[PDB]
Symmetry: D2
Subunit: 311 residues, 4 copies
Amino acid sequence: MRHFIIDCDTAEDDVLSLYLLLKNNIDVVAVTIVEGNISYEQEVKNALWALEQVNREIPVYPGANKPLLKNYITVEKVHGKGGIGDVTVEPKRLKAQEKHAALAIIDLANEYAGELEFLAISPLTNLALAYLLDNSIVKKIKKVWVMGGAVFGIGNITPVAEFNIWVDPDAAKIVFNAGFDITMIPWDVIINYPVTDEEWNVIKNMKTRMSELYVSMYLHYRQYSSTVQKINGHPHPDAITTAIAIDGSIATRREKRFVVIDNTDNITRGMTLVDRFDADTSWSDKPNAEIVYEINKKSFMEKIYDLLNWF
Amino acid sequence: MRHFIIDCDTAEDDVLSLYLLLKNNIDVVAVTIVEGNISYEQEVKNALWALEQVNREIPVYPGANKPLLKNYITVEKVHGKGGIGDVTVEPKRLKAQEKHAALAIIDLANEYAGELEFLAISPLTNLALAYLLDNSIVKKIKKVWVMGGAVFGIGNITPVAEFNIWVDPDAAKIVFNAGFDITMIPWDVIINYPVTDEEWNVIKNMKTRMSELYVSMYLHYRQYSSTVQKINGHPHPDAITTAIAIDGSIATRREKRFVVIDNTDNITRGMTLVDRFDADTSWSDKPNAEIVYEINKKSFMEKIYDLLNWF
Amino acid sequence: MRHFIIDCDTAEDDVLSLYLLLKNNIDVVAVTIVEGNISYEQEVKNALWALEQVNREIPVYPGANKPLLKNYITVEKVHGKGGIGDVTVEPKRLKAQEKHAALAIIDLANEYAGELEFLAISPLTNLALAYLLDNSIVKKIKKVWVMGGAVFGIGNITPVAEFNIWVDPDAAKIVFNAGFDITMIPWDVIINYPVTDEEWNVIKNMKTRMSELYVSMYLHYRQYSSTVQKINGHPHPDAITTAIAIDGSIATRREKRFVVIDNTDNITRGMTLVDRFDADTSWSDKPNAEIVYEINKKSFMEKIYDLLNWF
Amino acid sequence: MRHFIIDCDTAEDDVLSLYLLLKNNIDVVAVTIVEGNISYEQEVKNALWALEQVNREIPVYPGANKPLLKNYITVEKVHGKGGIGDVTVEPKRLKAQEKHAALAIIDLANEYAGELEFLAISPLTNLALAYLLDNSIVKKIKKVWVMGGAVFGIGNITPVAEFNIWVDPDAAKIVFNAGFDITMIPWDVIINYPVTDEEWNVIKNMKTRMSELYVSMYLHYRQYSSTVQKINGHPHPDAITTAIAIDGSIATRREKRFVVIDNTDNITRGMTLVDRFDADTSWSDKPNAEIVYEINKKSFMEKIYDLLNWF
Ligand code: NA
Ligand code: NA
Ligand code: NA
Ligand code: NA
């Protein structure tokens, strides 16, 4: 059995990623919450509410509510006030744990030493804080699956940077320098694989509780993604990362490269600068991340349709 | 009649660009020399020698031999010691002018006010110095055709930056902020259109003086480009820029965008950061450059074969 | 009764500062250890050994052994391999606690809420980590006494920066932005008040255990300070800070100003940039630190002689 | 005979510096104008008008009207709209030369090779541009006398930077790296030597044309300097620099040190960072400037009273 922590700035694609793991009988041992997409206290409530819909009592540990050093902005314009459109949900029964996410990560890394996997689909503040307190988690965590970066400089939050890295580039720099086994899925790869109008219409006609929930959660994000980002539909940054974590054959091209995080407050803040070892100069010959450059869209969407037929 | 200055850090593709203009009856009013690809004094001699092969006495004005502020490196590993392989040519009769290129640019902008075009296929130091001395050249020069940048961060001199901009990013920043009418051809566009083994073999069998010269001038560059940069053949960064300046239909996709030059001494030195007006934040809504994103390869190579049949 | 944590990159002046507090019946509730002056594991042993000489069993909590983000250098050339010259001491009985200093700071801030004082005579990594995990410590800690900075740009570790801030300028920036009640004693103030040859000779003739220990601990530092830094004797950066914490009248000039920490990796790394509200432009009108600009040397040395007569 | 160019962002202390040279029979071969203190076209008119009051026809060459790269602000709040209070003077007869100051500097460096001295009491843009066009001026100019910097980080335009360097720190970096023989007079040295109320009253009672002109030109600057900068009277940054150029014994302490110019757009823009070779690390052991740290106030004021008795 595989054991995962999922780290969430909880909006629509975080909820769907949690569900992809659970639907597929992956052991989710904790959900950790970090600043990012929407108001932090609503992110905590979103996760608790999400667990209730699937009858689970997995602990939710609130973590950092701001970056280590930098200021950031939430993006409720992108995801809705509640992260799933403008509805702001509230759990009926479940309550957040008191312990800080960074301390929970250390405890869980000990309990599941050598087998724990970390699904880093959000800003990296909690993982950085856990590392800073206990450097031994680099061996104890088997694998870090990172949704982050823009490896061709086609960013979302700025023209050249991706949101998760940009929110806390100091935390990202710490994580990328620590020695974790990282596989990274960039924004400017996943935008090549949007959910098309044809696919969206198929989902709207499924009429299961899950398909209805997906339509409800994604409508606002789809409108924004199409109108502002000029994406032909909506993207699945976190759900693609999660699908590859579950089934690695969904990734069809990977390269091990050396990634530098820009942690300045300059215009280049949050950029992922990638040495491919093919230029006239080089920064390092030691790769620190396996980067996914292509996926099998058909295989990915098969996992999504399977999830939406759950109930 | 069109009137051009060509600004050269003279290596193989600068020589071929000069010849493309001359073969095609474009009036080249001066050649200006700038630091870059190889030793500066050999760059001056290369240009004088090149003019001799085609019976012209166009003036050659030596300009800047170092960037405004930064240190740089020459790349004789890429182009050969002489910029056309390891041969180091010497003109028999022609001599360089005494006047600094920046002063010649100002004089020529006055003589050809409203019609002068500037083919900026090299680091931008001379054009920047001319602007700094006389800001009025922004109207007097009709068009600046720039070979420069990496708009997907796929660089040559560093992993993320292109050579011409990286050599003198202060000069580039001055040029991009001045208000010139700029059309820019990036490195990470032109590398999609290498001269293939099939095309190279056709050229090797042509047996004209020009085809023999092309083979001689490009052999070293082709070996390096294939082995280090992993290009399938060799690229034509300057000759593509020149071909588009002559015949704009060679460019098949263009976008007007806002380009920021990174002029730090940090790892991101020399990057061209491009706002496409499609992100959650934006730096400016005022474009400053028309960027070429695609070309017609067949049309471009037709111009090259035509040139090689000259004599 | 006043209650203090003392945070040490333990070398000679940290030992003397601990003793100044204890000699004078200030309640020291913990010693916390941070990276800085010498090898981290020897810093832990130095503190344990120091407590043994005065019959105390105060807990010692090892904290960060490296900066949050940056690389740093130890300075055993300045303080000796063991921080008190080249002797490397070892406690006979006392052992370090297991709990991380940052977690101990949070616990102690709760136990002594509203009365706890923090003597920050070292790099600020532990206090920053404690804040990041629990922001409420800003009210619970009554006062932070900081030895740090160079307010006229007369640095020690670099020409323009002071060691404690330079080692971890990210941690410093976090601390200075958090909202603590800070009084700061700069390097380029304390160097105006060295222990003179006259004073040193008086100490060498005292013949108490404490005076003999002081001579032993300071000989290497005095030689280095005089030969390299060109100080006329040796300075007491931490002991002056501590003396002012005990008796505020030792400070004879203070100003509340706005301090910005340079946390770049550029040449200005670690600078404390001070807005005095007297320039043609201003960064903020909100002070964040009370800075000590002058002391009464006679009063300070009276505290030192008193300490050396303890036993 | 000594031969000088004086480079002016012409306000009150530039006018007085020109007069100090002329009163004392130093050959002023040209006045060059640069962006800085007030509107550029008024700076040109100020210089022409100033020459008329002393019956000279020395050529005035307009130079740069903006920094090489950065934006800047004028400071008419400090000097008055006209740079000498709010009066905006106009020459009756003299006209500016057409030739750019940078080209005039090169011509004059050739005409007076080995003897020309450059009084750089303003932003360094013209000298940088002249160097960039002809690097040989570094030997041909005997001496550069620079009013600039803040060597204890006590700035005027920002809390930590001095105006002349801050306006164009790229130009400053070029000048300080070129190899000129530089003696530098910092802002945070000259502010120790203001014109006191006693001295001001003596001047107000002199009743010569020059004393009346001095009172008229300095009233606005004195009010501002006292109220904002908290100076006890008004300072003479340029006139002190000029006095030392004329009589070196006015400087009573000098040190040869290594000065780095901060040419970023960060908060530290325009800082002069000085390596004294006394820190635990060092940037270079090669000095590039002789810095004046103290003057004889009595000797300086004797030169001023002598000037005011001219007519
Ligand atoms: Na997320
Ligand atoms: Na070129
Ligand atoms: Na310390
Ligand atoms: Na001036």
